[PDB]
Design a protein around this ligand. Structure first.
Ligand SMILES: Nc1ncnc2c1ncn2[C@@H]1O[C@H](COP(=O)(O)OP(=O)(O)OP(=O)(O)O)[C@@H](O)[C@H]1O
Ligand SMILES: [Mg+2]
Lengths: 197, 194, 194, 152, 158, 193
């Protein structure tokens, strides 16, 4: 919708220096972050989006919520590409990020890119997904890493979160083959995302 | 393509070492280069005494250098030249890769925004000194070593791999001269940082 | 044209120009940040200067105790002052210009001697220069001058053999315009002594 | 980078200040406070002139989960640069009570800003012992005789 | 153009030039990201220039003392690990601890001498060891250079 | 009338006194300036919690040397950590004079009074704190129109009647007859002791 604060969780792996999108998957993601950011601002300008990475081996905030895209982009420059996103730590930090803002008029939305095979225990992540519904937070899981060679654990979490809510979670499946990551996330709902009320 | 070069190595090896090469090529087609790194590692453990190792790696430098992980390539190159009985040849390969990074990080660093090529450079310098210790020009080796040692301590946080290779050169020098004492302390750092 | 599908290559020639002008703009704005950096550094050193306060000079007139010193400040009235651990007792001695603070009144550090602003003009006017020879035919008087002046400068050890005091002191006097003043510029030029 | 933290001289102002920040965020029940330390370095004595709070929310499920604003740190530094321009990032304070090994990961983050090696100044807010309420530590990298590689 | 023209109808096949053009769309996409980044960075930078220089401009306006310079005696510049002075001090590891950059001693017309760290905007090429300088009267920092003094009766010669 | 209508006894916190002193001392000989942040309780008790300095100027203290940008921004930094309160007044340094407002400051105090009428001015001497005793005094304006209405006894109602003085003639005339003085006491907890 609009009036929405989004945290982007960018995966940083070595599954992202692989030839899957021109010129690389890491370069594809750059275009995608920006496409997301412009669509929310252009609809209403009271929408800000910030960026966290999984760079290092424990997630760091690059940038908090901003209306300046130039900020998001500058921080994406600063990266470690041998780092490793851990999901379980990234949902908890994102929930905290969301509770650090300048106004609480904004809906709670996480868009987390997943570009590695997920290898975090299922059993924990059930609990973290049900923690989100009691805070009024939705989570949009873009999968293009887990389809490729791995079991579909993230699908079950999405179902868990779904209850009558202002912003309710969504599953978007993005092809891993070359078809341009930036075009495919633009056609998927990202601003026409509904509640379930 | 690479299939034709690869085929020759497949013939000469054991039948039971034949399937391993097919999987390397399987990953290449699909364009998963993380998975190729992992696949490559396996051959090297149980057969770096083969000249098939050497061959394999030469074709790999040509078709992969920003495709597979940079670090995996240079670590291979330390291993490769231990298997080469030729020293003249060793010098040639070290200098091709070293030159190749210098032009490359001008383009590479800005476009990605990250990935340091100076880690490769040290791994490269370690192998050059190593080559001069195996040719037994001891004045030359030593002097590259003092220069290299200043250089390591400048770099704030040292990866274990780089400092491991440094400490190998240092061990090799000191038992050739047969200074028992100098050898002892350096090998305690070698065994540690393993 | 050759082709009627060269109508489509007009559009691709058009992109080509764009792609090579964006290469040229990326290296333009990095040379424009490199100019906004020198201008930012130029003004950032002023910020570090503006926040620094002055210091007031003295000299060590006399040791009072161990940690109390009599200075005669260049304000004029004598003070009694403290020491930092920056100075030592043995780096302080009488007739050393020392700095003081203007609100703590402690020696922070030793300074070299003061040197009047007037006397740097005297060291930087010698102009009117000429060689060994100034005016001729009065060479006999040029040679006499360097007996007193240049000869004890080079070797005091020849005035040691005689056991006389090393020569010094010259009065030049005479009718006007006679190169007394030129000779003076020439024994400063030729020897090149202070 | 270097070790040059042989002596750490700490202003009484800083201690006073640290207790004041700790209470006005009201971090109790095993909650922590982090702020920047501003001061001199490249001196054997490290001078702690001043401190300022950073907003930091520290979790109760784990100790490995924290929120810290990187964007905040620079703004704080540039305003304080205007006051006195001999103040640069020289570490960050922990409010204790005691050392943690999740502070190691935070140390590495402050190592970006610094041009010295980060001081971790456990300023205890509990006033335990009749001697100093400060123990000081710096994160340093070593190998060791045990067979232990690249230890922080 | 040296690619994609009537030069290359001869050289290469024109469906290879159809696919070339859709790869120049991919590379100018990467470059477009990279240019906007460098604009944004220069927008942060210009306001950090403005921030410093406004301060200097308060100090720059009137009134300020007028003095002469005793000497520039300097001190070694800051870049060292142990001190950065020309005169040896006690103790080890210094660079800003009591160590100081270049030095200018200036002599007032209020009749004193002050050892100040000289302004890093005013060069040693703009200081001669007799040069007539401004000094800021509130806190002694060499503010500007001004031309050499002349008495009123010498102005009246002109 | 209907209140205590007397100048607050400024209770300066353990943190604050040291911080004004360090901030004044570095800038000696040039005049220093800055804000006192505090809270207002009673009618005559202001506890000053913390301080911040407003950057230097080349003409030193002025009304002009107030910059809204520095004041407000620094304020929004402290807001995010929730250690901000409200501006209860301001400090500045005369190290070249004794305790008393100079001709410029009385006009700066008039603007400040306007905004908040409990605004104090505290003059710190960092150069007479090289003694065992710190020299520090507080003043707050009593308006020219106020003197005419003879409301000066109103300000000294319900006090111990113990005031401070600084030299004689000029200094003293400004102190008592144009501004009002109130003693300064020091506040602390047993944790800080
Ligand atoms: N012997 C000489 N040959 C050539 N030029 C000379 C000679 N002596 C003097 N002059 C010229 O005369 C100029 C001025 O004379 P100078 O100042 O050197 O002399 P002086 O004997 O000390 O007398 P005063 O001090 O009254 O000038 C010189 O600058 C030079 O051009
Ligand atoms: Mg003459």
């Amino acid at each position: 919708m609009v009036l929405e604060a989004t945290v982007l969780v960018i995966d940083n792996s070595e599954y992202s220096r692989n030839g899957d999108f021109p010129r690389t998957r890491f370069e594809a993601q750059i275009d995608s972050v920006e496409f997301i950011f412009q669509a929310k601002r252009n609809s209403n300008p009271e929408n800000t989006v910030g960026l966290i990475s999984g760079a290092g081996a424990n997630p760091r905030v690059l940038s908090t919520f901003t209306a300046e895209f130039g900020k998001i982009l500058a921080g994406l420059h600063d990266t470690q590409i041998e780092g490793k996103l851990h999901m379980a730590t990234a949902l908890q930090i994102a929930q905290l990020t969301l509770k650090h803002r300048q106004n609480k008029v904004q809906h709670q939305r996480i868009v987390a890119f997943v570009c590695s095979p997920i290898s975090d225990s299922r059993d924990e992540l059930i609990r973290l997904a049900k923690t989100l519904k009691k805070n009024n937070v939705a989570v949009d899981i873009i999968n293009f890493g887990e389809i490729e060679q791995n079991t579909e654990l993230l699908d079950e979490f999405i179902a868990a979160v779904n209850n009558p809510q202002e912003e309710t979670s969504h599953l978007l499946t993005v092809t891993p083959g070359p078809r341009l990551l930036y075009e495919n996330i633009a056609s998927s709902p990202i601003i026409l995302e509904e509640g379930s009320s | 393509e690479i299939d034709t070069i690869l085929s020759t190595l497949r013939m000469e090896a054991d039948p039971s070492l034949h399937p391993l090469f097919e999987q390397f090529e399987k990953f290449y087609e699909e364009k998963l280069w993380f998975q190729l790194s992992e696949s490559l590692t396996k051959f090297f453990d149980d057969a770096k005494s083969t000249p098939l190792r050497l061959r394999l790696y030469d074709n790999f430098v040509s078709k992969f250098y920003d495709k597979i992980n940079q670090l995996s390539v240079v670590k291979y190159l330390l291993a490769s030249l231990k298997d080469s009985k030729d020293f003249d040849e060793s010098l040639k390969y070290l200098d091709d890769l070293k030159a190749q990074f210098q032009e490359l990080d001008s383009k590479k660093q800005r476009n990605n925004g990250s990935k340091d090529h100076g880690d490769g450079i040290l791994l490269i310098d370690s192998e050059i000194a190593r080559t001069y210790l195996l040719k037994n020009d001891l004045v030359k080796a030593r002097d590259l070593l003092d220069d290299l040692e200043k250089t390591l301590d400048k770099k704030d946080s040292i990866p274990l791999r780089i400092t491991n290779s440094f400490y190998s050169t240092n061990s090799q020098y000191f038992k050739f001269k047969n200074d028992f004492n100098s050898f002892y302390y350096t090998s305690l750092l070698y065994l540690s940082t393993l | 044209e050759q082709e009627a599908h060269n109508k489509a290559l007009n559009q691709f020639k058009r992109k080509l120009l764009e792609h090579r002008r964006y290469d040229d703009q990326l290296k333009q704005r990095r040379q424009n940040i490199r100019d906004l950096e020198k201008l930012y550094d130029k003004t950032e050193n002023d910020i570090k200067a503006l926040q620094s306060i002055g210091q007031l000079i003295g000299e060590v007139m006399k040791e009072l105790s161990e940690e109390k010193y009599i200075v005669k400040a260049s304000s004029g009235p004598r003070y009694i002052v403290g020491v930092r651990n920056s100075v030592d007792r043995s780096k302080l001695k009488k007739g050393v210009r020392v700095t003081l603070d203007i609100t703590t009144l402690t020696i922070m550090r030793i300074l070299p001697r003061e040197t009047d602003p007037l006397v740097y003009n005297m060291t930087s006017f010698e102009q009117g220069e000429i060689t060994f020879d100034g005016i001729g035919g009065l060479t006999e008087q040029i040679r006499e001058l360097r007996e007193v002046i240049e000869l004890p400068l080079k070797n005091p050890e020849i005035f040691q053999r005689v056991g006389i005091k090393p020569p010094k002191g010259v009065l030049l006097y005479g009718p006007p315009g006679t190169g007394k003043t030129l000779l003076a510029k020439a024994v400063a030029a030729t020897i090149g002594a202070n | 980078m270097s070790l040059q933290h042989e002596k750490v001289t700490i202003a009484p102002l800083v201690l006073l200040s640290a207790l004041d920040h700790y209470e006005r965020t009201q971090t109790k029940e095993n909650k922590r406070c982090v702020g920047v330390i501003l001061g001199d370095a490249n001196s054997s004595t490290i001078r702690v002139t001043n401190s300022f709070a950073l907003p930091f929310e520290e979790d109760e499920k784990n100790s490995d989960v924290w929120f810290l604003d990187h964007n905040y740190i620079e703004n704080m530094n540039e305003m304080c640069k205007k006051i006195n321009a001999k103040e640069k990032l020289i570490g960050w304070y922990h409010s204790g009570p005691k050392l943690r090994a999740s502070d190691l990961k935070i140390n590495e983050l402050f190592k970006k800003y610094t041009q010295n090696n980060p001081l971790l100044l456990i300023v205890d807010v509990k006033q335990q012992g009749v001697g100093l309420p400060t123990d000081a530590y710096v994160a340093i990298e070593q190998v060791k005789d045990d067979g232990t590689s690249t230890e922080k | 153009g040296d690619d994609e023209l009537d030069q290359e109808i001869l050289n290469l096949s024109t469906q290879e030039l159809q696919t070339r053009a859709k790869l120049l769309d991919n590379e100018i996409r990467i470059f477009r990201s990279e240019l906007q980044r460098l604009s944004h960075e220069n927008n942060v930078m210009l306001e950090k220039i403005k921030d410093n220089k406004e301060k200097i401009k308060n100090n720059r306006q009137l009134p300020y003392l007028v003095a002469n310079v005793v000497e520039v005696m300097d001190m070694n510049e800051i870049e060292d690990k142990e001190n950065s002075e020309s005169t040896t001090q006690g103790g080890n590891v210094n660079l800003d601890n009591t160590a100081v950059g270049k030095a200018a001693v200036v002599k007032t017309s209020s009749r004193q001498t002050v050892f100040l760290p000289m302004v890093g905007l005013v060069d040693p090429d703009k200081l001669k060891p007799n040069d007539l300088v401004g000094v800021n009267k509130d806190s002694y920092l060499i503010l500007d250079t001004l031309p050499s003094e002349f008495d009123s009766r010498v102005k009246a010669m002109e | 009338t209907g209140r205590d209508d007397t100048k607050e006894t400024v209770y300066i916190s353990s943190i604050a006194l040291l911080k004004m002193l360090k901030h004044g001392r570095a800038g000696v000989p040039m005049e220093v300036m800055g804000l006192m942040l505090g809270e207002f309780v009673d009618d005559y008790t202001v506890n000053v919690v913390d301080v911040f300095a407003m950057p230097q100027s080349g003409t030193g203290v002025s009304v002009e040397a107030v910059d809204d940008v520095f004041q407000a921004k620094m304020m929004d930094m402290l807001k995010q950590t929730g250690r901000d309160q409200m501006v209860v007044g301001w400090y500045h340094s005369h190290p070249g004079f004794g305790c008393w407002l100079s001709s410029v400051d009385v006009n700066t105090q008039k603007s400040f009074e306007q905004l908040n009428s409990r605004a104090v001015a505290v003059v710190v001497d960092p150069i007479q704190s090289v003694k065992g005793k710190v020299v520090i005094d507080a003043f707050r304006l009593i308006d020219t129109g106020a003197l005419i209405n003879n409301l000066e006894p109103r300000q000294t109602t319900s006090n111990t009647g113990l005031l401070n003085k600084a030299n004689i003639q000029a200094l003293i005339h400004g102190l008592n007859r144009h501004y009002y003085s109130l003693n300064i006491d020091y506040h602390k907890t047993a944790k800080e002791t």
